Structure formats: structure tokens, C-alpha cells
Design a protein around this ligand. Structure first.
Ligand code: HEM
Length: 129
């Protein structure tokens, strides 16, 4: 399930999803912020498929690291971990009528390979600083 896949994330983003200041952004309380944006859910898929780099802001704090791609995970595994990060800490409550992630959303986005630099560009397209 989603919780089991999340073990591959917890070393950085932590068991409680709160991250580590300066090093690894929080997911708890922050996934809702991303989901609130038009293109937010697609963006979360792109991070897992293609990784991320560059300076970003989360809860007013700056991060300047690199996340690897997790494209070795199957479409259903990516859908599962994304549902875990959306629900484990109540981020999906804040979002009106949240539909769970599904394999076909990941499949669709696997069809157009991006670089981590392009993923950052996508994040900025959301209105996120
Ligand atoms: C499948 C497991 C993982 C998931 C679901 C996950 C989730 C995410 C998400 C959703 C973001 C975007 C946050 C934002 O744009 O505000 C992100 C960024 C980031 N993640 Fe992960 N992550 C995972 C594994 C890891 C691991 C293992 C590491 C450590 C090696 C890591 C380090 C980072 C870093 C450093 C960033 C920010 C990149 C930057 O500063 O530009 N992640 N992660």
C-alpha cells in the first residue's frame, strides 16, 4: 500500500511528513497547498516521475536541494504514495471533494518525459514561489 511505499520517502521527508528545516520540505500541511493550485495534482506526479531541483519556498522557508526521480515505481505505486501523502496528515480534508490519485494519471504523464529543471518550471507555473 501507500504507507509501505512511503518508506522510500521517509528518510528525507520523515515519518510524520514534516520534513527537516532547510533540507527536506514538509509534505504534511503542504500537499494541500499544492493541490489547491490548478495543475497541483499533475505537478505532484511530475515530481515523483522526474525529480526536482532549484530554490523553492515552503511555509516561507527556503530549500535549495535536489530530489531524485522515482520513475522505477509503477503507475499504481506512484498513485499509492501520493494518496498516502495527501491523506496521512489530513491534507486532503482541506481540499473540496479530493479525488484519489489513479494509475492512469501517472501513465499519461509518463508519456512526456521532463527534466528536474522543467519540473521546477511547472511548480512556478502554479504560482508557487
Ligand atoms: C517517493 C518518495 C518521495 C516523495 C513522495 C516525495 C515527495 C516530494 C514532493 C511532493 C516534493 C515537492 C515539494 C514542493 O514542491 O514544495 C518534494 C521535493 C523534495 N524532495 Fe521528495 N519525496 C520523496 C523522496 C525523497 C527522498 C528519498 C529525498 C532525499 C534524498 C527527497 C528530497 C526532496 C528534496 C530535497 C525536495 C526539494 C527539492 C528542491 O529543493 O528543489 N525526496 N518531494
Amino acid at each position: 500500500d501507500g504507507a509501505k511505499i512511503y518508506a522510500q520517502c521517509a528518510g528525507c521527508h520523515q515519518q510524520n511528513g514534516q520534513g527537516i528545516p532547510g533540507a527536506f520540505p514538509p509534505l504534511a500541511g503542504h500537499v494541500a497547498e499544492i493541490l489547491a493550485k490548478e495543475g497541483g495534482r499533475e505537478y505532484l506526479i511530475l515530481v515523483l516521475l522526474y525529480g526536482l531541483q532549484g530554490q523553492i519556498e515552503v511555509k516561507g522557508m527556503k530549500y535549495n536541494g535536489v530530489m531524485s526521480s522515482f520513475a522505477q515505481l509503477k503507475d499504481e505505486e506512484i498513485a499509492a504514495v501520493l494518496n498516502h501523502i495527501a491523506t496521512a496528515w489530513g491534507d486532503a480534508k482541506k481540499v473540496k471533494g479530493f479525488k484519489p490519485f489513479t494509475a492512469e494519471e501517472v501513465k499519461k504523464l509518463r508519456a512526456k518525459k521532463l527534466t528536474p529543471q522543467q519540473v521546477l518550471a511547472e511548480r512556478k507555473k502554479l504560482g508557487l514561489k
